[PDB]
Design a protein around this ligand. Structure first.
Ligand SMILES: *[C@@H]1O[C@H](CO)[C@@H](O[C@@H]2O[C@H](CO)[C@@H](O[C@@H]3O[C@H](CO[C@H]4O[C@H](CO)[C@@H](O)[C@H](O)[C@@H]4O)[C@@H](O)[C@H](O[C@H]4O[C@H](CO)[C@@H](O)[C@H](O)[C@@H]4O)[C@@H]3O)[C@H](O)[C@H]2NC(C)=O)[C@H](O)[C@H]1NC(C)=O
Ligand SMILES: *[C@@H]1O[C@H](CO)[C@@H](O[C@@H]2O[C@H](CO)[C@@H](O[C@@H]3O[C@H](CO)[C@@H](O)[C@H](O)[C@@H]3O)[C@H](O)[C@H]2NC(C)=O)[C@H](O)[C@H]1NC(C)=O
Ligand SMILES: *[C@@H]1O[C@H](CO)[C@@H](O[C@@H]2O[C@H](CO)[C@@H](O)[C@H](O)[C@H]2NC(C)=O)[C@H](O)[C@H]1NC(C)=O
Ligand SMILES: *[C@@H]1O[C@H](CO)[C@@H](O[C@@H]2O[C@H](CO)[C@@H](O)[C@H](O)[C@H]2NC(C)=O)[C@H](O)[C@H]1NC(C)=O
Ligand SMILES: *[C@@H]1O[C@H](CO)[C@@H](O[C@@H]2O[C@H](CO)[C@@H](O)[C@H](O)[C@H]2NC(C)=O)[C@H](O)[C@H]1NC(C)=O
Ligand SMILES: *[C@@H]1O[C@H](CO)[C@@H](O[C@@H]2O[C@H](CO)[C@@H](O)[C@H](O)[C@H]2NC(C)=O)[C@H](O)[C@H]1NC(C)=O
Ligand SMILES: *[C@@H]1O[C@H](CO)[C@@H](O)[C@H](O)[C@H]1NC(C)=O
Ligand SMILES: *[C@@H]1O[C@H](CO)[C@@H](O)[C@H](O)[C@H]1NC(C)=O
Ligand SMILES: *[C@@H]1O[C@H](CO)[C@@H](O)[C@H](O)[C@H]1NC(C)=O
Ligand SMILES: *[C@@H]1O[C@H](CO)[C@@H](O)[C@H](O)[C@H]1NC(C)=O
Ligand SMILES: *[C@@H]1O[C@H](CO)[C@@H](O)[C@H](O)[C@H]1NC(C)=O
Ligand SMILES: *[C@@H]1O[C@H](CO)[C@@H](O)[C@H](O)[C@H]1NC(C)=O
Ligand SMILES: *[C@@H]1O[C@H](CO)[C@@H](O)[C@H](O)[C@H]1NC(C)=O
Ligand SMILES: *[C@@H]1O[C@H](CO)[C@@H](O)[C@H](O)[C@H]1NC(C)=O
Ligand SMILES: *[C@@H]1O[C@H](CO)[C@@H](O)[C@H](O)[C@H]1NC(C)=O
Ligand SMILES: *[C@@H]1O[C@H](CO)[C@@H](O)[C@H](O)[C@H]1NC(C)=O
Ligand SMILES: *[C@@H]1O[C@H](CO)[C@@H](O)[C@H](O)[C@H]1NC(C)=O
Ligand SMILES: *[C@@H]1O[C@H](CO)[C@@H](O)[C@H](O)[C@H]1NC(C)=O
Ligand SMILES: *[C@@H]1O[C@H](CO)[C@@H](O)[C@H](O)[C@H]1NC(C)=O
Ligand SMILES: *[C@@H]1O[C@H](CO)[C@@H](O)[C@H](O)[C@H]1NC(C)=O
Lengths: 226, 130, 213, 446
């Protein structure tokens, strides 16, 4: 028994979002299942929108989102749909379709969870990434180690790869995951900690690669000379 | 425990299982047991099904099983019909193979069951006369 | 609605440790609670149902206890594959709510965070939007407190946090706080700072910078 | 220590028995009076049974005979309210049609004029129509009569209904179960390792064919040969193949249907003047797909015999037109195509479309029943038919000298074989809820 979600991964704001979950019923089993939808944001606890039965179809919705959520099902093609009208920026999360049913023949709960589909609500489209150099301050040269990096802003969609010195430099390189901004575009940062003695003698160049738009950006990072 | 779904074994799904495993799937089969030429043929089929169920219910009614699915009987099981161990006839044999094994002794068992129940009712009547 | 309580959020534990996770409820739940384990990029999996029965296909090391409004998950011998997020979900009545989460990681020595601040460049200012980045590196435990101060006053809002996964070489962490503001809001102020407080820091680290210098 | 017999109720026991299967449909005038069937279940349950090896067998189930009887009853019930076309058997003065006729289609049509009755009994009218050569015979400008004049008269197909073969589901009443074989490599007769209990049959298309099975169910993964006895020479062979081949049949004659009042409320639909060009009706099949299908059939049939023998395909042996040519229905018109162009190849060990001419017959007697014919009325416009071949009915020739050069010819008189390639998976059994398994209980004695 397995479950799978389907639908548009990227959707525009203010319209109705529709998701479809395919069910794989257990062989030689008759009765009733309980299908439910649970979304989980990035770095946030999961949230359950609603649930429904397979034989009666009694839909139960969350009071915080009962005015926008709508769960429907059909036995003709054995599928259940999820509708969410007037999507906002907070709706960007990973959706999961679950089926709860206790088999009386084996006395097991059978708590199966689907892999989930990432749904992003934004108004932006495919475009090139913006790179900004995060150079260390001039007053931080007294310390033994200094951190420098490159910031990726105003880019969509995933993914982007950031490398240092054409991939040869890998010690201390930390690439933070992308976080959706308020403007509807992703952004991240790549940093690296190097000793202060290497400043002014080694050329540090960060390379950003963007597969959906096929953009190659190369930027040199150096301290601000005063 | 508010979104718990209950599913049971399907119709005739315990055919290939053992005797003990199929012994708990009797209720599903019991509940699932029930322009003029088309109407008369479908009516005759439904009447025949009802008559067959009535005959089976009467067969269990003449014995000491008026309604209960599982019931015992004081008459013993002779080894002439099937001399097999209980540890393997209930865990290593299905209902199809077991029914095909002693299909020649069903009438004898039914006759002895009906006469045993008749003499049991007579003995109970004589016991209540005290 | 029903609020779900759970403690703690993040804690340190070694291999084979005897660790418990507490979870409380706002009302009476009795015994209709389940424990779930979720890994990064994977769906949650059921571990203990009805607060006392072990789910099939799960190791016997996990256990549950408690009743009414108190619930506690117990591990007998911690294993490296158990390092994931744990949630407690109620099922007594609608709506269905989860806990705050509990992240378990490998215990190691306490290391002070290397806090750095990146001022915005001229091109970023001319682009219309600026983003001040405060970075932390090589710190343990997972919990830390980072706050933003503008002109010497503590401020909230318009701040995002990006945290990477645990390093498999030195078992350290990397933290990045981004303060995204507009050009007018950035030019309206002059002093910007990020203050970080950690267990390995005896004094609050404050990184400040000025627009003029 | 002793055992005691205990009777059980509702145990899974099966017995081979014959029952009456009732039809069902989606219930969407209708065709073939589908309103007599109860509505089908939108969610049919499928129960896969494990650890079971129930025996399956064709040519013996009563489901094919029940389907045949049901089709006969539905056909009679559909043709009963139609008008009886009995009084047109008169002297038909016929002439040949030479209005831009071709060389191959020459002599097939005949313009016949005759006196037909009208609404008023005391008056008659001189009308003219067009009849095919297969529907008229000469009596010794000439006089001809219909082929069914010396045979029992019959009705005509009412234009309110059509011959569309809508799917039908055969469901069993209470106390019976239907088991299907889910094995992809299922043999013609033998045990099936994957048995599944189903509420009733899937969408079954009641197609009518005599040489090539069309619009049926495709195979699971490869070609399959089915027969009651492969070594028997008189036994028919049913071959089913997974990738279907498309056939495009056309009737370029743009004939016009004419209504003739032959009494009170009785309208005879005859063929009027054919406007435009005239050409023989024919079917087209792809050469590459047919060659690939023939090669797959030959490869699958070579395992049943020696690998060194060769096999040759020949045309029909002979007999009546019902079995010597491929007869089917498209848009209400009956087609009789000469399939000699398809079975004209040999197989030795180790721009591209085949066309075959077809004839149209109005006096059709389906179900091989002497008498009780059916007059097919003409259909206005060009008839275009598209279909998929899902199987063939082959027959091995006699003799078999030294088990070499096996010649296969198409055939099949009975229509039961047409459904034997569809109801082979399905079977009906009677459930026995009685069991006498013993245990150690004794019951509370009084
Ligand atoms: C095997 O399967 C194939 C399917 O591929 C069948 O082919 C179908 O044959 C039927 C007739 O036997 C065709 O139906 C006819 O279609 C004509 C064209 O109409 C088109 O447009 C309408 C409106 O959108 C559609 O409904 C229709 O399906 C077509 O797409 C119609 O003019 C015909 O009308 C006749 O019937 C109506 C009643 O329905 C009367 O009112 C009319 O007066 C007229 O008599 C008719 O509907 C069908 O189009 C074919 N399918 C395809 C895909 O072409 C084979 O028949 C089937 N069997 C065999 C033996 O091969
Ligand atoms: C229940 O009754 C049936 C019917 O009487 C029994 O079936 C019969 O079984 C015998 C063998 O037990 C069959 O005899 C066979 O004869 C052939 C030809 O001589 C021989 O080659 C075989 O070796 C075998 O001896 C017999 O054909 C068969 N059928 C009939 C109609 O008699 C069945 O065995 C009985 N079961 C029990 C458990 O008593
Ligand atoms: C079909 O048979 C298999 C094999 O016995 C059953 O699967 C389980 O197999 C293990 C093997 O050790 C046994 O211990 C179990 O007792 C079996 N299960 C049961 C319920 O008996 C399988 O269940 C059977 N399935 C059917 C439909 O009969
Ligand atoms: C239709 O009826 C007419 C009228 O009876 C038939 O015409 C007669 O034909 C016979 C035989 O040739 C002649 O002896 C009569 O003199 C004809 N009568 C008239 C009034 O013409 C005619 O043969 C019938 N059949 C057809 C096909 O028209
Ligand atoms: C299938 O048909 C063949 C025909 O060849 C049958 O073979 C016969 O086998 C018997 C065996 O005793 C011989 O005496 C006959 O001479 C064979 N027939 C011929 C024509 O030679 C075979 O028995 C059939 N299989 C069945 C009916 O199951
Ligand atoms: C079949 O023959 C009849 C005559 O028996 C034809 O009917 C007349 O044919 C002429 C010349 O073709 C037309 O001018 C008339 O209008 C037709 N009708 C009548 C009532 O006289 C008929 O056309 C012939 N049909 C074919 C297909 O050749
Ligand atoms: C209430 O019903 C659910 C099924 O929907 C069941 O699982 C649960 O145990 C029931 N509660 C009690 C107290 O019986
Ligand atoms: C039946 O049980 C006896 C002991 O009571 C044992 O000796 C014998 O082997 C068993 N037979 C089978 C077939 O299990
Ligand atoms: C008319 O057609 C028939 C065949 O149906 C043929 O035998 C006859 O010779 C033809 N007559 C003429 C004049 O073409
Ligand atoms: C009817 O006539 C045709 C043509 O002469 C002939 O073949 C057929 O045998 C006849 N049928 C009867 C029953 O006389
Ligand atoms: C099918 O069954 C017949 C008769 O039992 C047998 O001769 C033949 O070999 C079988 N074929 C396959 C593929 O099992
Ligand atoms: C057949 O004739 C009718 C008469 O109006 C015409 O409308 C139609 O287009 C013709 N069809 C063909 C295929 O010639
Ligand atoms: C069949 O093929 C012939 C080949 O010349 C072509 O003329 C005819 O139009 C085709 N008919 C159809 C219905 O494709
Ligand atoms: C039959 O007609 C269809 C119409 O789309 C065409 O695609 C197909 O190739 C044709 N097949 C043959 C054998 O002519
Ligand atoms: C089928 O294709 C093969 C390819 O070599 C060819 O030899 C054979 O003659 C073809 N058969 C027909 C009937 O086209
Ligand atoms: C015929 O060829 C097939 C496929 O190689 C093989 O399995 C079979 O054993 C062969 N039979 C004979 C009689 O050589
Ligand atoms: C078709 O079969 C008939 C016998 O029914 C035969 O006379 C004729 O020669 C055959 N045609 C071909 C091309 O083989
Ligand atoms: C099919 O057409 C060929 C053309 O030569 C002919 O010889 C054959 O007899 C026809 N088939 C039948 C069954 O008449
Ligand atoms: C069958 O093939 C032979 C090969 O020469 C040819 O002469 C004959 O005309 C063909 N018959 C048909 C009906 O295609
Ligand atoms: C014929 O086959 C094609 C391809 O699978 C399919 O799309 C079409 O529906 C089929 N038509 C019929 C009548 O089965």
């Amino acid at each position: 028994v397995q479950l799978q979600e389907s639908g548009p991964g990227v959707v525009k704001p203010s319209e109705t979002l529709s998701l479809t979950c395919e069910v794989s019923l257990h062989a030689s089993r008759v009765g009733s299942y309980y299908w439910s939808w649970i979304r989980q944001s990035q770095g946030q606890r999961p949230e359950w929108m609603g649930g429904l039965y397979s034989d009666t179809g009694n839909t139960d919705y969350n009071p915080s989102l009962k005015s926008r959520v709508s769960l429907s099902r059909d036995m003709s093609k054995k599928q259940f749909f999820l509708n969410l009208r007037s999507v906002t920026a907070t709706d960007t999360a990973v959706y999961f379709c679950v089926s709860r049913y206790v088999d009386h023949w084996t006395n097991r709960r059978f708590d199966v969870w689907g892999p989930g589909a990432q749904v992003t609500v934004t108004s932006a489209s495919t475009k090139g990434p913006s790179v900004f150099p995060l150079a260390p301050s001039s007053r931080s040269t007294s310390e033994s180690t200094a951190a420098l990096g490159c910031l990726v802003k105003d880019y969509f969609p995933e993914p982007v790869t950031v490398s240092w010195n054409s991939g040869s430099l890998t010690s201390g390189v930390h690439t933070f995951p992308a976080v959706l901004q308020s403007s509807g575009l992703y952004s991240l940062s790549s940093v690296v900690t190097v000793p202060s003695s290497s400043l002014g003698t080694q050329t540090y160049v960060c390379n950003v690669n963007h597969k959906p738009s096929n953009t190659k950006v190369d930027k040199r990072v150096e301290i601000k000379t005063c | 425990a508010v979104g718990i779904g209950a599913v049971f074994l399907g119709f005739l799904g315990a055919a290939g299982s053992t005797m003990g495993a199929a012994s708990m799937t009797l209720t599903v089969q019991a509940r699932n047991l029930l322009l003029t030429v088309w109407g008369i043929k479908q009516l005759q089929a439904r009447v025949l099904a009802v008559e067959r169920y009535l005959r089976d219910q009467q067969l269990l009614g003449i014995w000491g099983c008026s309604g209960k699915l599982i019931c015992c009987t004081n008459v013993p099981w002779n080894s002439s019909w099937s001399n097999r161990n209980l540890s393997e006839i209930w865990d290593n044999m299905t209902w199809l193979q077991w029914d095909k094994e002693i299909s020649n002794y069903t009438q004898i068992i039914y006759g002895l069951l009906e006469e045993s129940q008749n003499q049991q009712e007579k003995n109970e009547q004589d016991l209540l006369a005290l | 609605d029903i609020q779900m309580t759970q403690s703690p959020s993040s804690l340190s534990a070694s291999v084979g440790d005897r660790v418990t996770v507490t979870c409380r409820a706002s009302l009476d739940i009795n015994k209709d609670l389940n424990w779930y384990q979720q890994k990064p990029g994977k769906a949650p999996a059921l571990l203990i149902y009805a607060a006392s029965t072990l789910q099939t296909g799960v190791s016997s090391r996990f256990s549950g206890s408690g009743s009414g409004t108190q619930f506690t998950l117990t591990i007998s011998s911690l294993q490296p594959e158990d390092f994931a997020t744990y949630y407690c979900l109620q099922d007594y009545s609608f709506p269905l709510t989860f806990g705050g989460g509990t992240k378990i990681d490998l215990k190691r020595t306490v290391a002070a965070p290397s806090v750095f601040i990146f001022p915005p460049s001229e091109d970023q200012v001319k682009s219309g939007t600026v983003s001040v980045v405060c970075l932390l590196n090589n710190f343990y435990p997972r919990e830390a407190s980072v706050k933003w101060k503008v002109d010497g006053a503590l401020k909230t809002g318009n701040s995002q946090e990006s945290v990477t996964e645990q390093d498999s070489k030195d078992n350290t962490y990397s933290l990045s706080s981004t303060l995204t503001l507009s050009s007018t809001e950035y030019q309206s102020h002059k002093v910007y700072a990020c203050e970080v407080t950690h267990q390995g820091l005896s004094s609050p680290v404050t990184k400040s910078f000025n627009r003029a210098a | 220590e002793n055992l005691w017999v205990t009777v059980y109720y509702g145990v899974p026991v099966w017995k081979d028995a014959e029952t009456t299967l009732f039809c069902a449909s989606d219930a969407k005038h209708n065709v073939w009076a589908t309103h007599a069937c109860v509505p089908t279940d939108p969610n049919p349950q499928e129960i896969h049974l494990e650890n079971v090896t129930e025996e399956f067998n064709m040519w013996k189930n009563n489901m094919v005979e029940q389907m045949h009887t049901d089709i006969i009853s539905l056909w009679d019930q559909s043709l009963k309210p139609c008008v009886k076309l009995t009084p047109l058997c008169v002297t038909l003065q016929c002439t040949n049609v030479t209005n831009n006729i071709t060389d191959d289609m020459r002599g097939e049509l005949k313009n016949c004029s005759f006196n037909m009755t009208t609404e008023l009994r005391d008056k008659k009218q001189k009308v003219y129509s067009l009849f095919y050569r297969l529907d008229v015979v000469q009596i010794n400008n000439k006089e001809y009569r219909l082929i069914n004049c010396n045979t029992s008269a019959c009705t005509q197909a009412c234009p309110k209904v059509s011959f569309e073969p809508i799917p039908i589901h055969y469901c069993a009443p209470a106390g019976f179960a239907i088991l299907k074989c889910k094995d992809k490599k299922f043999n013609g007769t033998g045990p099936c390792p994957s048995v599944s209990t189903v509420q009733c049959t899937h969408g079954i298309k009641p197609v009518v064919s005599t040489q090539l099975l069309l619009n049926g169910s495709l195979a699971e993964e490869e070609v399959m040969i089915r027969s009651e006895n492969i070594t028997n020479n008189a036994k028919n062979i049913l071959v089913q193949f997974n990738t279907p081949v498309q056939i495009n049949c056309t009737r370029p004659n743009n004939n016009t249907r004419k209504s003739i009042r032959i009494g009170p409320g009785q309208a005879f639909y005859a063929t009027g003047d054919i406007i435009g060009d005239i050409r023989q009706a024919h079917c087209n099949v792809s050469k590459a797909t047919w060659n690939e299908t023939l090669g797959k059939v030959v490869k699958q049939l070579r395992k049943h015999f020696g690998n060194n023998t060769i096999i040759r395909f020949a045309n029909s042996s002979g007999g009546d037109l019902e079995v010597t040519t491929h007869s089917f229905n498209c848009g209400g018109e009956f087609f009789y195509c000469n399939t000699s162009g398809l079975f004209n190849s040999t197989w030795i060990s180790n721009n591209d479309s085949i066309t075959l001419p077809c004839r149209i017959k109005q006096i059709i007697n389906m179900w091989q029943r002497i008498g009780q014919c059916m007059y097919a009325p003409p259909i206005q416009g060009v008839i275009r038919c598209v279909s998929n071949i899902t199987g063939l009915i082959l027959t091995r020739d006699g003799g078999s000298t030294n088990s070499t050069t096996e010649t296969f010819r198409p055939g099949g008189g009975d229509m039961r074989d047409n459904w034997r390639s569809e109801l082979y998976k399905y079977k009906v059994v009677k459930i026995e809820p009685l069991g006498v398994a013993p245990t150690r209980c004794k019951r509370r004695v009084v």
